[PDB]
Every structure is written in C-alpha cells, then in structure tokens.
DNA sequence: ACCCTAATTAGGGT
DNA sequence: ACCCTAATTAGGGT
C-alpha cells in the first residue's frame, strides 16, 4: 500500500480544469507540460500545467486506470459513436473538494 | 527457400543510388516513398522511389540483415566514432551489375 | 551519414 | 473531444 494523494490531486484537478470534455489523455498532456495542438493555450497559463513531468505518460495512464477501478474517475461515451470522455465521479468530486482545502490521502493496493 | 531477387534489386540499387553515404535507413526511406527531410528531393525523381512501399520498414530492415549475412552488403565504420554506413560488397556490386541488364535470382534460406 | 527514444501530428476507423 | 498506428523530427551517446 502507498499514498498516491499528491499525484491524485494533480490528475483529478487536471480533469476538473479541462472541463471533462476530453478523454484522460488531455489531462495527462496538461500535467506533462505538452506543447501538443490538442491542448488549448489558455490552459498553459494554469499553475498546474507541466507539474507532472516527474512521471511518464505511461505512468499517468496506468494511474488513471487504477483511479477508475477505485471509482474516482469514469469513462463515458459522449458526442458521437467515436468519442468518450473521462469524468470525476461524485466520489472523485468529494475527494477533490476536500483536497482543495487540505491534503487528502488516496491509498492504493 | 525463396527467390528475393526483385527485392534485392531494389535495395542494392537504393544503396548505390544514395552513394553508400548512409546506413540502410535512408535506402529504405527512399524505397518506401518517404517525405523525410533526411532524403534529398533529387532522389524523389528516381524511378525506384516509392517502389518498395508494399513491404514494411521492418521487413526491409530484416531483409538487409540477411543480405549482410550472405555477403551482399557490409557495414563500415566511417566519419566519426558514432557512424557506420551500409555499402555494397564486391559480391553485391557484381550481382547488381548483372541485375541491371537481366533479372537475377537471389535465393535465401 | 549510426541507433534509440520521446514528442508530436495526420488520417482511418472504434 | 476516442482509439491505435505510421510517419516524422529533435536530441544525444558511444
């Protein structure tokens, strides 16, 4: 078991910030400080942009999968037959709401 | 056993055309019809440009390995400590010289 | 003129 | 606003 609270704060915040209009790849690009065309410039102004460079894109993906399993995030069909987005669940919003005023743990396996 | 003469003609021709100035990557980019910056535009006017499109870069690389083992191609250290080029052997050049006027077989395994 | 890897992009469908 | 993959380009070791 390990407390992933600090990393969960970054990722769940990124999902919130980007408005749950994209899949999890965009929050990850955001945290990894990407210059990708997929990510709008307005977001590069946010203080969290590029603050997740310590971890690889692959790591952040693996992490997002666990957070889905644990019920903090969910993926759902949106827009059309091709697309899905990644969203905070109510549980994820509750955790984030608290995390926004003091550090929260999020322990995994 | 299979006769790879038609493919050998393309690859050994490509090595010669690029002047043995590179490793095997540039000959393959040439055969696969690449838009790469690495490949000068003058070569895109050659009749063999893009004629190896029906085999993957991976295949051509594997194929080049066999041709080295069978003594048609050699890798040669050149320029500086980082570099090697892929050249025709005397055998490879004799084979290509004949292949230029009538089809030659090149039987593998 | 090497090779490898990460980052990015275009384009089809999944 | 997705996926996976091919293609391309930059950096740097040795």
Q: How many distinct helices (H) and strands (E) make up chain B? A: 4, 4
DSSP string, A2-67: EE-HHHHHHHHHHHHHTTT-S-THHHHHHHTT---TTS-GGGGGSTTTTTTTTS-HHHHHHHHHHH
User: What are the backbone dihedrals phi and psi of residue A82, each rounded to the nearest 5 degrees, phi first?
Assistant: -90, -35
CATH number for the domain that contains residue B48: 1.10.10.10
d(CA A24, CA A73): 10
Half-sphere exposure of B88 (CA within 13 A, CB side): 22
B105 touches strand D (CB under 7 A): no
- Is the CB of residue A3 less than 8 Å from the CB of residue A106? yes
Contacts of A5 (CB under 8 A, 6+ apart): A99, A103, A104, A105, A106
- The number of angstroms, rounded, from the C-alpha of A73 to the middle of its chain's C-alpha atoms is 8
Cα dihedral B84, B86, B90, B92 in deg (nearest 10): 160
Q: What is the dihedral of CA A70, A71, A72, A78, to 10 degrees?
A: 130
CB of B28 within 8 A of CB of B57?
yes
Position of tokens 């997740």? Answer: A52
Q: How was this model experimentally determined?
A: X-ray
> Within window 14-73 on A, which residues have Cβ closer than 7 Å to strand C?
29, 32, 34-38, 56-57
The encoded tokens of residue B67 equal 């041709």
For residue A12, say whether its CB is under 7 Å from any atom of strand D: no
Closest CA to B86 of B42, B22, B37: B22
Asked whether residue B85, judged by its CB, lies under 7 Å from any atom of the DNA or RNA strand C, the reply is: yes
On strand C, nucleotides with any atom < 7 Å from a protein CB are 1-3, 7-10, 13-14
Domain count, chain A: 1
Boundaries of domain holding B20: 1-109
Resolution (angstroms) stands at: 1.9
Are A84 and A23 in contact by the 8 Å Cβ rule? The answer is yes
Query: Rounded CA gap, A107 and B92, in Å?
Result: 63
Q: Would you say the C-alpha torsion B39, B45, B50, B51 has a positive or negative sign?
A: negative
Helix, strand, coil shares, percent, chain B, to 5: 45, 15, 45
Q: Give φ, ψ of B95 to 5 degrees.
A: -65, -50
Task: Name the token pair of B89.
Answer: 């052997």
């Amino acid at each position: 078991s390990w407390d992933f609270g600090p990393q969960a704060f970054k990722l769940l915040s990124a999902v919130d910030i980007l408005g749950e209009k994209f899949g999890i790849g965009l929050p990850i690009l955001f945290l990894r400080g990407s210059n990708s065309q997929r990510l709008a410039d307005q977001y590069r102004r946010h203080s969290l942009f590029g603050t997740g460079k310590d971890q690889t894109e692959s790591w952040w993906k693996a992490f997002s999968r666990q957070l889905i399993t644990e019920g903090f995030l969910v993926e759902v069909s949106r827009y059309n037959k091709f697309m899905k987005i990644c969203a905070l669940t109510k549980k994820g919003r509750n955790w984030l709401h608290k995390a926004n005023t003091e550090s929260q743990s999020l322990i995994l396996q």
